[PDB]
Design a protein around this nucleic acid. Structure first.
Ligand SMILES: [Cl-]
Ligand SMILES: [Cl-]
Ligand SMILES: [Cl-]
Ligand SMILES: [Cl-]
Ligand SMILES: [Mn+2]
Ligand SMILES: [Mn+2]
Ligand SMILES: [Mn+2]
Ligand SMILES: [Mn+2]
Ligand SMILES: [Mn+2]
Lengths: 78, 107, 11, 92, 97, 93, 108, 86, 98
DNA sequence: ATCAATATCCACCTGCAGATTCTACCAAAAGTGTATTTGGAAACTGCTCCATCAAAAGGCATGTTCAGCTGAATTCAGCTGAACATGCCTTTTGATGGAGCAGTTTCCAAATACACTTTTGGTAGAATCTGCAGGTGGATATTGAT
DNA sequence: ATCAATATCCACCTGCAGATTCTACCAAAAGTGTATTTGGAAACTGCTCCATCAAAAGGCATGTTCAGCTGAATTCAGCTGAACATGCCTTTTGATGGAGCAGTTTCCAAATACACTTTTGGTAGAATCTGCAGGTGGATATTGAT
C-alpha cells in the first residue's frame, strides 16, 4: 500500500518544505523513510494498545508513542 | 466560614486546587508544599497568556477574530523564546512558516 | 494582573 | 467526567484579547500545551527534590525548575508571576 | 501557446503550500498503509479516526521538516535539486541513522 | 557514611562470563552509571504506563512492556526471557 | 523460625532484588510495587550487564589485555548495532572513538 | 586573599588542541577560519552546561559545583555522561 | 631533507588520535576557562576536580562528534577541507541552532 | 526596458451551515475545621577536599618559510526533470446499520502496605598482589626522491 | 624498478599505582503477623468503528518537448600542511590552611489524614456567528518578441 503515497503527494510535501527541484530517485527514498517512521511510531502505539488489553488503537496510544520517539504532538490529547 | 478558592486568593485564573491534585496524583514526590501549586498555576497561566496574546495578534493580522491552529503556529515560530521552548513539538494543523531560500529565487 | 514581555497586562 | 483546561484558557484569552475567540482544534492545542509544560516543570522539580534527598516539592523547586526549563525573558516573567502569586496567596 | 519556464510553477507551489495547513497525502491511501503496517504487529485491530489523523499530522510534519533539512543539504553542495544523497546526510546528522 | 553501588554484582557477572578478566575502577564507574541509567529508564517508562492506565501499582507486567518499548530487538527478546524466567523461578519459591 | 534466603537467590539472579525493590519504592514511580517487578527488572539489568561485559571482555582479549578499561566498553558498545542504539546519546568517559576514516580522504 | 582575575581564557583552547580534536573526529584538512568557530561553539556549550550545573549548586544551597551537578546538567541537555557518579 | 606530502601526516594523526583516549585539551587552560565562565554566572564558586574533568570529557566528546558531522558536510560538498560553513550546517541540522 | 498577451492572484461583497458560545443543572472535587505526624531548618562541628603556592623541566605552543595541491572559477554539453495537455479511476463523502468493544459497577480473593523484630550482606578501610605503561631495540613496512 | 629516511610494529623488562584480598561494624534485607486496597472476573451499556453502497470530481498517471542544471574537465592562485627554531607555561609532586560539606541532634512550622460542607466544572441541549466558499473584476506577474 506504500505505492499509494503518490508522486504528486510527495512533491507537495517537499514543496511545503521549500523545495524547488526534485530528483526522480527521491520518491522511493521518501516512501522508504516514511515506511520506517510509521513502523516505529505504530509499533510503539500498538505496544500501548496491547498493554491496555485493548483491541482498538486510540489517539492517546499514538500520542504517547510520538512523545516517546521525541515527536511530541499537540492537539489529540494531553 | 465561607469558601475562597485558592486561585482567587492567589489572584489567578488557572485552577490552583486542581494543579495541587495533579501534583499528588502524579507521584512526583511523597509530599507537596502549600505554595507549589500556586507557583505552578501562576507559571501555567502566564505561558498561556503569552501564547494567546501573540496568536491573537496573528489572528488579527490574517484578519480573523477566531484563533485557529495556524495562528498559534505563526505565534510560536515567530517568537524566538517560545520557539525554543517548543522546539520539538508539532502543533497539529500548524503549517509552516513561509520561507524560501534565497538561492532558489529567480534572476 | 500578569505582565507580559510585550508590556501588556492581564485582567 | 472528562476534565480539561478549556475554561481557564478561555478566561485568559478574554483578559488578553476580549475581542478574540478560539476554535476547538486550537483549544485542543492549548490544552496539550498546558499538560506538556505542567509535566516538564513537575518532573524537573521531582528530580530536584530527589537529588537533594528531599521528600517534598515546594515552590522553591518549581522555581528552580522554571529557571532550568524556560529560556530568557520567559523565565524572568515566569519567576515573577510565580513568586508574586505565592506572595498574594500567602497574605489572605 | 503560452508556457511558464521551468521553476516558476515550482516556486509558485512553494508559496502556495507553505501558506496553507491542510494535509497533503490522500487520506484513504494513508489509512490503508497504516492498517497494513499495524497488521504486521497485531491482527484484527481497530483504529480511532482521531488516531489515524494523529498519525497523518505527525507523519506529514516529520517529512516536511526532513525536506527542509534535505533542501539545505542540496544547497550546501552548490545544487538546487534534492537527491537521496541529501536525505541520507540529513538523517545521519539528525542521529536517525 | 556509606555509598551504595553495584560493583559487587557487576563483578559477579564479570566472573560468570569472563573468569580470567578483571575490571578497572574507571570501567566499573562506567558500568555503574550504566545500570543506574537503564534502571531509571525502565522504571520511568513503566511509571508512565501505570499512570496511563490509571493503575496505582507497577507490576512485572509494566516492567516488561517498559522493556519492549525501551530496548531494541534481540536485546528485548533476550531481556524478556531472562525476566520471565526470574519471575517464574521466584514464584515457585 | 526459618532461615533467610535472599530474593535474588530464589530467582537465581546475581543482582540485588531487595535493593532494586527499595529503589523502586523510594523513587516514587508509583503508589505501590508488585512483588515481581523488582525481580523482573533486576533480571533485565543483570542480563544487559552480562551482554556489555561479554563483548567488552572480548575486546580486552583482542587488545592483549586482561583487565577491562573504559575503551573496551566503548569498542564493545559502538561495534554492536543494538547496544549502540540503546546508548546512542551516552558518552563513555575515556572511550575514544571507533577508528574510522572516510574513504575519500585516503590517498588516490 | 583573592586570585588573579580570569580573562580571555577561551584563547587557552589553542589551535593545536582544536586540530587534535578534529583528527580524532576524522578531519584531514582544516580551513583557517575553523579555530575561532570552534572556540565560539565550545564557549556556548560550556555556558549552557555550566549554567545548569551552577543552577543545581545554588539550589542545593552549596558553594561547590560537584561532579553530580555537572552530570545532571549534561543529562538535562541530553548529553548523558557515564563515569562520574549518577 | 625528507618531507611527507601534504595530507600524509594528517592521516598519520587521524590514526593516532583515533587509537587513543587521552583528553586533547590541556587541563590547566581548560580549568581556567571553566572557572571564568562559572564566575560570570555566580561568584566565589568552588569546583570538585571531578566536576572539571566531567566537563572536559563532555566537551571534548561533543566537539569530536561535531567534527565528525562537520566532516561529512565537507565531503558532501565535494571538499576535503572543513569550513565554518560546514560546522554551521551540522549545528543547524542537529537542531542546536535556528 | 517596453509592448502585448496569457494566466495568476487579490479585494471587495455576500449569504449561511457548521461550529462556537451560552444556559440550565448536578455529582465530584475543593475548601474547612480538627487531629497527627513529619520534614528539613537551625545550631554545632568533625574533617575531607579544595584553593594556593613553589620549583623544576621538558612537553608543546608560536611564528616563520615554502611549496603541494585543494578550492573555486570557467566552460560546456548531455540528459534529467519541469510544465502541460489528456484521459481514466481511485478518493471523497454521506448515510445507514449493526455490532464489537471500551467504559462502568459490584463484589471478593489475592496481593500489597504496614509495624516490629532478628539476621546477614555490603561497605569502609587496611592488608597484599600484579597487570601493564613506558622505555628499548631489532625487524618490517611505508613513503617520497632519483 | 630501486633506495634512504621514517614510522610502525612488537617482544621483552620492571617497578608500582592501582586492583584484589581480608575483617569488622551496621544499616538494610528478610521473616511474621494484621490491616487495606486493588483491580479483575462477570454482568451489561451506549458508541464509535467497520462495512457496504453508490455515485462524480477532481486528482493521478502517461507521454511529449526542451529548458537549464548537474557533472565533468581544466587552470591557477593562494591557502593550509609540514618542519624547524625558540622559549614559555603546563605538568608534577608535596605541603598547609581552612572553607564548607556532611553527620548528629533538637523542634516548630508545615503538611497529611479524616469527615463534612459547598461550589465549581462538565455535559448536553439551547441560542448565535465567523468564515468559507464563490463570484467577478481589478492589478500583478511572467514570458516572448522588437
Ligand atoms: Cl511550598
Ligand atoms: Cl543520491
Ligand atoms: Cl508484580
Ligand atoms: Cl565558511
Ligand atoms: Mn569574569
Ligand atoms: Mn524527623
Ligand atoms: Mn606499551
Ligand atoms: Mn459553574
Ligand atoms: Mn474566502
Amino acid at each position: 500500500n506504500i505505492q499509494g503515497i503518490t508522486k504528486p503527494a510527495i512533491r507537495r510535501l517537499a514543496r511545503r518544505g521549500g523545495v524547488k527541484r526534485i530528483s526522480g530517485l527521491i520518491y522511493e527514498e521518501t516512501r522508504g523513510v516514511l515506511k520506517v517512521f510509521l513502523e516505529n511510531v505504530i509499533r510503539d502505539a500498538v505496544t500501548y494498545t496491547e498493554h491496555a488489553k485493548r483491541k482498538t488503537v486510540t489517539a492517546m496510544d499514538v500520542v504517547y508513542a510520538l512523545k516517546r520517539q521525541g515527536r511530541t504532538l499537540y492537539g489529540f490529547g494531553g | 466560614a465561607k469558601a475562597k478558592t485558592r486561585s482567587s486568593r492567589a489572584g489567578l485564573q488557572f485552577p490552583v486546587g486542581r494543579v495541587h491534585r495533579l501534583l499528588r496524583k502524579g507521584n512526583y514526590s511523597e509530599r507537596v508544599g502549600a505554595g507549589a501549586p500556586v507557583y505552578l498555576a501562576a507559571v501555567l497561566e502566564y505561558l498561556t497568556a503569552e501564547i494567546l496574546e501573540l496568536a491573537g495578534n496573528a489572528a488579527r493580522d490574517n484578519k480573523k477574530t477566531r484563533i485557529i491552529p495556524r495562528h498559534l503556529q505563526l505565534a510560536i515560530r515567530n517568537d524566538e523564546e517560545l520557539n525554543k521552548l517548543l522546539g520539538r513539538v508539532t502543533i497539529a494543523q500548524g503549517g509552516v512558516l513561509p520561507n524560501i531560500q534565497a538561492v532558489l529565487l529567480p534572476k | 494582573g500578569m505582565r507580559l514581555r510585550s508590556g501588556r497586562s492581564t485582567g | 467526567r472528562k476534565e480539561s483546561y478549556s475554561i481557564y484558557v478561555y478566561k485568559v484569552l478574554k483578559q488578553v484579547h476580549p475581542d478574540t475567540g478560539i476554535s476547538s482544534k486550537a483549544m485542543g492545542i492549548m490544552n496539550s500545551f498546558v499538560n506538556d509544560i505542567f509535566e516538564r516543570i513537575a518532573g524537573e522539580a521531582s528530580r530536584l527534590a530527589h537529588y537533594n534527598k528531599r521528600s517534598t516539592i515546594t515552590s522553591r523547586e518549581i522555581q528552580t525548575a522554571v529557571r532550568l526549563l524556560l529560556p530568557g525573558e520567559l523565565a524572568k516573567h515566569a519567576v515573577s508571576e510565580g513568586t508574586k502569586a505565592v506572595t498574594k496567596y500567602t497574605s489572605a | 501557446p503560452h508556457r511558464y519556464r521551468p521553476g516558476t510553477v515550482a516556486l509558485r507551489e512553494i508559496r502556495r503550500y507553505q501558506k496553507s495547513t491542510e494535509l497533503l497525502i490522500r487520506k484513504l491511501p494513508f489509512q490503508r498503509l497504516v492498517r497494513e503496517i499495524a497488521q504486521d504487529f497485531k491482527t484484527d485491530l481497530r483504529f480511532q479516526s482521531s488516531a489515524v489523523m494523529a498519525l497523518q499530522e505527525a507523519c506529514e510534519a516529520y517529512l516536511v521538516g526532513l525536506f527542509e533539512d534535505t533542501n539545505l543539504c542540496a544547497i550546501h553542495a552548490k545544487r538546487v535539486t534534492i537527491m537521496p544523497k541529501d536525505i541520507q546526510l540529513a538523517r545521519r546528522i539528525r542521529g536517525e541513522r
